[PDB]
Amino acid sequence: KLKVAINGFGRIGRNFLRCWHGRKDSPLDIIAINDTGGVKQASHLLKYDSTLGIFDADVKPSGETAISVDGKIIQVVSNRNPSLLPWKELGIDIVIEGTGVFVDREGAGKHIEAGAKKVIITAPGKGDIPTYVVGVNADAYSHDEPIISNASCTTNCLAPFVKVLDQKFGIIKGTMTTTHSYTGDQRLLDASHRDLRRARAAALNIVPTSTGAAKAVALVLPNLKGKLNGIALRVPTPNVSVVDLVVQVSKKTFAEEVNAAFRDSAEKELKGILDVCDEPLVSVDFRCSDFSTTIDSSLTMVMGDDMVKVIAWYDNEWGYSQRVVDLADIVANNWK
Amino acid sequence: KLKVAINGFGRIGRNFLRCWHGRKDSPLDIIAINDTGGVKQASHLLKYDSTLGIFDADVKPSGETAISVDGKIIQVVSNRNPSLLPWKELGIDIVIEGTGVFVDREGAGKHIEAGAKKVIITAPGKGDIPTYVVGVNADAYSHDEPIISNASCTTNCLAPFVKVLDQKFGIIKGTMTTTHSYTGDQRLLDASHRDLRRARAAALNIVPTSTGAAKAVALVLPNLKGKLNGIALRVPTPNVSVVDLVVQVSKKTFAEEVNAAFRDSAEKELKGILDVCDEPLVSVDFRCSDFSTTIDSSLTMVMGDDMVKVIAWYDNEWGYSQRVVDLADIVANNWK
């Protein structure tokens, strides 16, 4: 049973801890956390979440350095330098790089310097770091890789239904726009920032932001290279987001067949990953959805017989974390 | 003919410029701006504003270390250490401290050691710093004061009607609660904060937080020392705020006679600082109100003859900033 540690206990990290706490008979065993803020703060924010709500588990301090979650004791370290974490001391098999700053080999490599055997970046890796979206190419993983990426939340949404779209109807080319819930990277009010878009009031505007989570599909889906690209729009909802894909398949078709196609994946090779929704719900209805992508069938379109349009709901925080746990399980099972 | 620098081009440094811009015959002249970013953000965010909208003026860069605002050109420095600012170089006379991290005598004195001849904290002071409020006591300023404080947005709203309330009824003791718009201090989503509450999603929550305005009022209203107390409630509104004051007065009275008094003031002394509104308005209807305090007379109650409750509106960003300038001018007009 592997020993996990969460580095960077922000939104993703906490979601991960809860997603993990959720799994029955897990190959993982979270033993440590590390955020700049210390125990007192780790415990509070874990317990009280403006989004996920109040964690239905017995959270509370243990000693003066650890916390206890339903009796499970988790050490809470606090060092801004990955290089100086007690990983070797705690016997950490894998690290969940959730800080969003250690994404290249140098960055994450420190976690291995520190004594941990594997880093799993919860974001677009950098350099020649092997990326994986569970349910698509998560099978490509070999134990040789110490540091890996799990892509972005958007990428984890498209890949599964784009896998289905290019697979069957063969994708010629496509564009994409994701109307996304703002995230920690934006200002609350107009204050300086590098990206003049993100510097504006997040919960007030509709902010557009160059993504790159489109082209990224190429990594997990060798094919789609140079075929996809896109942008994102940020909107006044703290969570849950939606993907707008306009592909151009070769094999002509119609909606009923497109979604029909999805439903089949949904029960075949993408169960627990892809989901199709026929009931007319809204963003918030997808809070805590374990599906990297849920299609809005009543929204599918086809123009010119070949120009296919699909709509997908995803919980930017929750679902992605559910994946990150799966990816860790994968790592934990093909543990050479 | 008075050189002025703006240290901290944030929500307050910016409203100051725009407050000052619309100034009929200023004794001041904004020479420079300093922050972390340069002209890229300086200019961009002075022309745009998810609160004050587009700035009507030709805001365009003027080199790579300056900007042009309707012809006149303002230098744009970028060092976080006030000792290193070319205050002597440009020969600045007075500094607007709006960084929010140099409110202490030691820290604010840095602009003085870097050239500037006088500093003004756009916040409450720490150390031997004279605190002044326009309409209440800014008429006690002495030209020999190197560093001074304009207090906070909340105290500036409170001090005015408390002055009228005490002078005309005599306050025994009292309490206040300011329902205030969120600020850059809070988090967009549950992120870390020294304050476990401000660390909660600012646009999804009503966040209780402490305020020192109630004790501050005694700074400028001596007869008030130790009679007030209060807290703040951060609500999901980007700007404009309201203080809810309750005071036990010495002289028995009634809602109407009170407002009557408030009116006499908005006309005689606090004319221009305080304003009794009668319209059944709302928060937004108060944007850019140049008044420190606008009393909603309709809301004014009087329980059991001596327990008075007043509700005053104020624009935390804009109304304050105007006071700043005003005091900045008081400084100018006492020079030497």
């Binding site: 800080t99 969003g100 700053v101 974001a123 677009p124 972005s152 939340c153 958007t154 990428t155 994701t178 996304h180 995230t183 920690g184 990277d185 200002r187 204050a191 300086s192 920032h193 590098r194 990206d195 993100r198 510097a199 993504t211 790159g212 989570a213 994102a232 987001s241 930017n316 | 972390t36 970013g37 340069g38 890229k40 953000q41 790579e64 970028s78």
Partner: peptide
Amino acid sequence: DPLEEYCKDNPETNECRTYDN
């Protein structure tokens, strides 16, 4: 440009933080 540099050493700061979503 000042900011770009600042960010290079303070990637997690308010005026830097950049996420792919």
